[PDB]
Amino acid sequence: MTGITNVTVLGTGVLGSQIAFQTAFHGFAVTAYDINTDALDAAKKRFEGLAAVYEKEVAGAADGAAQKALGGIRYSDDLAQAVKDADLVIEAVPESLDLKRDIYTKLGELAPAKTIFATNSSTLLPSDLVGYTGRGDKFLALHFANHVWVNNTAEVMGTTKTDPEVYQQVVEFASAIGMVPIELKKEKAGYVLNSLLVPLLDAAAELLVDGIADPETIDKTWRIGTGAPKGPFEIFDIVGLTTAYNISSVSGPKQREFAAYLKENYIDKGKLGLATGEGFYRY
Amino acid sequence: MTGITNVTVLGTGVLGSQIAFQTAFHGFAVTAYDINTDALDAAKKRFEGLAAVYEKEVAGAADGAAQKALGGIRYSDDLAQAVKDADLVIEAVPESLDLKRDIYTKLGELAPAKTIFATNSSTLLPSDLVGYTGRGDKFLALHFANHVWVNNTAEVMGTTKTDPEVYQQVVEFASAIGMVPIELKKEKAGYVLNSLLVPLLDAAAELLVDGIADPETIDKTWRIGTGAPKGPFEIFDIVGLTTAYNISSVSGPKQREFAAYLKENYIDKGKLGLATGEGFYRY
Ligand SMILES: NC(=O)c1ccc[n+]([C@@H]2O[C@H](COP(=O)([O-])OP(=O)(O)OC[C@H]3O[C@@H](n4cnc5c(N)ncnc54)[C@H](O)[C@@H]3O)[C@@H](O)[C@H]2O)c1
Ligand SMILES: NC(=O)c1ccc[n+]([C@@H]2O[C@H](COP(=O)([O-])OP(=O)(O)OC[C@H]3O[C@@H](n4cnc5c(N)ncnc54)[C@H](O)[C@@H]3O)[C@@H](O)[C@H]2O)c1
């Protein structure tokens, strides 16, 4: 047949760069798109960093293989040229409705008929975007996790409009780039992982904010009770407290009470979690 | 000082027997109370079984130590005699409000002033029972997990009335019988562990019932995403599907929809989980 060969990634931020690099590392012809030459310069820095991480952390990356993947990546700040022969476009632009709306409007026009579109969006449903694409049969979500080389799940989630054959092609692509395809059958805000994790972290937050128990007690209870390696608060530190704060602040009232607790006790003290070396725990 | 030495366990069922045995194994003077001689005969069978499990599974139980703990246990079907010199009474009678109400009414009268009372209740708050005890300062919850020798958490949870010194004595007792004391500061339905686990299992159930993803997909997502050894549905099988059914049937509407799903697809087919060798998974 034909299969996916040319992949364009829109956006070269934290996830955009990991997606493009993982994809290049697995032999696909990757184009990295971003808005201007300065953004593309930064993208190149991220790729060089990722090549270094892979050579130390990823099977098969040693002895120049990651550096070769680095060298094969194409850079473009011209959307029309970036997607001109694209089999797959993975959209990883900022989590902005209007910004994504603008992109898919243009993308739908500029991209050849064959091109499959996939959003990496965490908070926007593909149904919120499918309209702006102009090709609902070729639109779906392909959702990655930060540090794709280790957290290698790829959540595949389409709309009722998505073409079954497109879906399966994206599933095969995901396996081809070393991911574990997590196949959703219907749209769900938060996909699978976030749908499972948020309720756990919310329950932990509630226990803390209502003064039922301290973080350490809550965590050891979870590790002993389920055999899990890390408790909810260790997980908060990994997620990053700034991130947890933002998410909780736009959630229910109990979670908003947690946000204030984070803001007062951690964020305002510079204790942001694993990143700064200290959050609920000191590292 | 004095400390806890004489412990009476009320009820010799699944948890009553494990509590009494773990306590006897750690050198305390244990009396096992139950309603009649036939119940006490069954209790003795459970203890003999537990001694066997310990000798294979528990450090220090080999070479007759567990058999010696077995031999030291006293049996009583006379409540007054059973608690006559009790320092601690652990209540593990059926999860029946009126049945527990009846017990604490009598217990409060028959037990010497020194006696601390602790309920192992999963669904009834100590505040729902504290009134019937007559000694609110000496009443609190000490909540164990099935298979106490491996899941060795002991959740300690009192009322506003509970005496701080009693609480700490129960904490020390818990450590003395080889448990990890999980100290709650305020009453909370479900203590810590259940408070964390139910929301996770509910979210998994919702994903299943609404047809978002299958059990296997949901489980691998959790294991990969959090590094957990077992996913929600593996956990359901361990909990037991009959149990999950009962709990879900008296929960919210989404959970009740899950109960029906369990009833139709698993319970009615004899697939009850780990116990029967097959639930969501085949073992
Ligand atoms: N950050 C995460 O952990 C995470 C997890 C899962 C999914 N995602 C999703 O990925 C996307 C965000 O990516 P990120 O946060 O990893 O990187 P980022 O948000 O830090 O970077 C955004 C990229 O898009 C570029 N960009 C900015 N404006 C643009 C525009 N107008 N047109 C095209 N590109 C533009 C930015 O310059 C940058 O290259 C969102 O859909 C987000 O929901 C992020
Ligand atoms: N089963 C669990 O996994 C679990 C977990 C945590 C806490 N608990 C709690 O422990 C108690 C239930 O114990 P279990 O389910 O492990 O054993 P069980 O319920 O199978 O056995 C109940 C024991 O109480 C006895 N009993 C019956 N009527 C009595 C009465 N009228 N007066 C005194 N004793 C009576 C029964 O004969 C038996 O000895 C409840 O408080 C329950 O919430 C159970």
Side-chain angles (χ1 to χ4, degrees):
Chain A
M1 300 64 63
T2 61
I4 299 178
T5 298
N6 300 333
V7 180
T8 299
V9 181
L10 307 182
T12 61
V14 177
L15 271 67
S17 63
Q18 298 180 36
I19 297 176
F21 192 86
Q22 180 71 355
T23 296
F25 181 63
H26 288 260
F28 295 82
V30 176
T31 299
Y33 168 87
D34 209 337
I35 65 178
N36 64 21
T37 62
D38 290 353
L40 295 174
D41 295 346
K44 182 181 179 181
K45 299 296 181 57
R46 295 185 176 92
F47 291 137
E48 294 173 343
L50 291 170
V53 176
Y54 276 52
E55 58 198 0
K56 300 295 181 180
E57 301 292 330
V58 178
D63 302 345
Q67 202 72 5
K68 178 180 178 299
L70 177 61
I73 295 178
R74 183 167 64 94
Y75 299 80
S76 178
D77 64 3
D78 182 344
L79 184 57
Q81 293 292 326
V83 299
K84 62 179 180 180
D85 189 2
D87 297 323
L88 175 59
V89 175
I90 302 175
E91 175 273 302
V93 302
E95 192 65 346
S96 175
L97 176 57
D98 297 345
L99 188 173
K100 297 194 185 304
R101 176 182 55 88
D102 182 352
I103 298 299
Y104 289 100
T105 301
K106 302 179 181 178
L107 186 60
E109 300 179 343
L110 302 177
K114 64 172 181 176
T115 305
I116 299 176
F117 300 157
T119 180
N120 181 49
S121 182
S122 295
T123 61
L124 300 175
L125 298 176
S127 62
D128 298 339
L129 300 172
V130 58
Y132 307 126
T133 64
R135 61 182 69 187
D137 58 327
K138 297 179 177 297
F139 183 58
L140 52 58
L142 181 62
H143 181 246
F144 296 77
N146 190 11
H147 294 210
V148 302
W149 63 92
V150 56
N151 301 345
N152 61 335
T153 58
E155 293 172 308
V156 185
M157 187 180 70
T159 64
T160 59
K161 301 178 179 179
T162 302
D163 176 355
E165 176 59 346
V166 177
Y167 185 101
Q168 181 66 8
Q169 296 182 348
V170 176
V171 172
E172 301 178 347
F173 168 79
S175 300
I177 61 171
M179 307 299 293
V180 178
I182 300 302
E183 305 181 9
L184 292 67
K185 302 175 180 180
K186 302 180 180 181
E187 293 197 349
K188 174 64 180 62
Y191 303 89
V192 177
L193 178 51
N194 295 342
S195 297
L196 296 175
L197 182 62
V198 174
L200 176 58
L201 301 181
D202 289 348
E206 178 288 332
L207 295 172
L208 181 61
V209 174
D210 296 344
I212 307 302
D214 62 1
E216 298 75 8
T217 295
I218 296 177
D219 285 352
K220 63 181 178 181
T221 301
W222 188 248
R223 296 192 305 267
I224 295 179
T226 64
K230 296 179 180 302
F233 297 97
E234 293 173 274
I235 296 179
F236 276 127
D237 284 350
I238 296 174
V239 175
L241 302 185
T242 305
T243 297
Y245 168 74
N246 292 335
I247 299 178
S248 298
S249 61
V250 301
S251 300
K254 183 57 60 181
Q255 299 73 359
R256 291 173 51 91
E257 187 175 343
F258 179 61
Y261 181 90
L262 288 177
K263 187 61 166 56
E264 178 179 346
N265 298 139
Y266 297 88
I267 306 301
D268 292 351
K269 298 184 176 183
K271 300 182 179 181
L272 304 185
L274 195 63
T276 66
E278 184 180 2
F280 286 101
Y281 299 90
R282 184 177 183 92
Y283 299 90
Chain B
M1 300 64 63
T2 61
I4 299 178
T5 298
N6 300 333
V7 180
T8 299
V9 181
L10 307 182
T12 61
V14 177
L15 271 67
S17 63
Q18 298 180 36
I19 297 176
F21 192 86
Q22 180 71 355
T23 296
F25 181 63
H26 288 260
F28 295 82
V30 176
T31 299
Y33 168 87
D34 209 337
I35 65 178
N36 64 21
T37 62
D38 290 353
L40 295 174
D41 295 346
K44 182 181 179 181
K45 299 296 181 57
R46 295 185 176 92
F47 291 137
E48 294 173 343
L50 291 170
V53 176
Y54 276 52
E55 58 198 0
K56 300 295 181 180
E57 301 292 330
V58 178
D63 302 345
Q67 202 72 5
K68 178 180 178 299
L70 177 61
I73 295 178
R74 183 167 64 94
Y75 299 80
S76 178
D77 64 3
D78 182 344
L79 184 56
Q81 293 292 326
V83 299
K84 62 179 180 180
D85 189 2
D87 297 323
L88 175 59
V89 175
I90 302 175
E91 175 273 302
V93 302
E95 192 65 346
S96 175
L97 176 57
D98 297 345
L99 188 173
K100 297 194 185 304
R101 176 182 55 88
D102 182 352
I103 298 299
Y104 289 100
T105 301
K106 302 179 181 178
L107 186 60
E109 300 179 343
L110 302 177
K114 64 172 181 176
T115 305
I116 299 176
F117 300 157
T119 180
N120 181 49
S121 182
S122 295
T123 61
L124 300 175
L125 298 176
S127 62
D128 298 339
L129 300 172
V130 58
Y132 307 126
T133 64
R135 61 182 69 187
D137 58 327
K138 297 179 177 297
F139 183 58
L140 52 58
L142 181 62
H143 181 246
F144 296 77
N146 190 11
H147 294 210
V148 302
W149 63 92
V150 56
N151 301 345
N152 61 335
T153 58
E155 293 172 308
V156 185
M157 187 180 70
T159 64
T160 59
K161 301 178 179 179
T162 302
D163 176 355
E165 176 59 346
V166 177
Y167 185 101
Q168 181 66 8
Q169 296 182 348
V170 176
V171 172
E172 301 178 347
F173 168 79
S175 300
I177 61 171
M179 307 299 293
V180 178
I182 300 302
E183 305 181 9
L184 292 67
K185 302 175 180 180
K186 302 180 180 181
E187 293 197 349
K188 174 64 180 62
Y191 303 89
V192 177
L193 178 51
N194 295 342
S195 297
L196 296 175
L197 182 62
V198 174
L200 176 58
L201 301 181
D202 289 348
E206 178 288 332
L207 295 172
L208 181 61
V209 174
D210 296 344
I212 307 301
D214 62 1
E216 298 75 8
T217 295
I218 296 177
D219 285 352
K220 63 181 178 181
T221 301
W222 188 248
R223 296 192 305 267
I224 295 179
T226 64
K230 296 179 180 302
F233 297 97
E234 293 173 274
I235 296 179
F236 276 127
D237 284 350
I238 296 174
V239 175
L241 302 185
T242 305
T243 297
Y245 168 74
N246 292 335
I247 299 178
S248 298
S249 61
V250 301
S251 300
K254 183 57 60 181
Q255 299 73 359
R256 291 173 51 91
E257 187 175 343
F258 179 61
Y261 181 90
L262 288 177
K263 187 61 166 56
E264 178 179 346
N265 298 139
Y266 297 88
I267 306 301
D268 292 351
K269 298 184 176 183
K271 300 182 179 181
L272 304 185
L274 195 63
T276 66
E278 184 180 2
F280 286 101
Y281 299 90
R282 184 177 183 92
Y283 299 90

